[PDB]
Amino acid sequence: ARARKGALVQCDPSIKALILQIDAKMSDIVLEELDDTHLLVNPSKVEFVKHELNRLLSKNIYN
DNA sequence: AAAAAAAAAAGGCGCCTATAAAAGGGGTTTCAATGTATCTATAACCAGGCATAAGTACTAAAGGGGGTGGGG
């Protein structure tokens, strides 16, 4: 009966957890948790999330 | 004392030895060199047992440099 625009993000559970951590810090990122591997995210924040994930993973001093 | 059987002995018969010289054939009996199965000393064969040399992996060591994380 209702539709809303957004960006669907499909990712592994560990990445889902990381995006939730990003949201908790920055807010206004995650619109809905959909399932263990899917989120609805603010479309204007998708590139931010992708860049931040890359930084979190690639720049980790314990790599 | 007698008849009887068993025994040793004799006499006789036959053939042997050494003598002799000289013409053709067939017999059995013993001994010659040349070979199978079995023997001998030799040479050569396997498997099994002990000692020495070569190769193994193993543990064994010490010496250092570089990168990442934590603390000041």
Structural biology method used: cryo-EM
3-state secondary structure of A23: helix
Q: Which residues contact A1 (CB under 8 A, 6 or more apart)?
A: none
Resolution (A): 6.0
Determine whether the distance from the CB of A61 to the nearest atom of strand B is below 7 Å.
yes
Determine whether the distance from the CB of A63 to the nearest atom of strand B is below 7 Å.
yes
3-state secondary structure of A12: coil
Chain B, protein-covered positions (CB within 7 A):
68-70
Find out whether A16 and A37 touch, Cβ atoms under 8 Å: yes
Chain centroid to Cα A24, Å, comes to 11
A7-10 and A38-41 as β-strands: parallel, antiparallel, unpaired? antiparallel
d(CA A16, CA A1): 28
The 10 Å CB-count burial string (b at 16+, else e) for A15-51 is: bbebbeebbeeeeebbbeeeeeeebbbbeebeeebee
- Which DSSP symbol is given to A44? G
Determine whether the distance from the CB of A62 to the nearest atom of strand B is below 7 Å.
yes
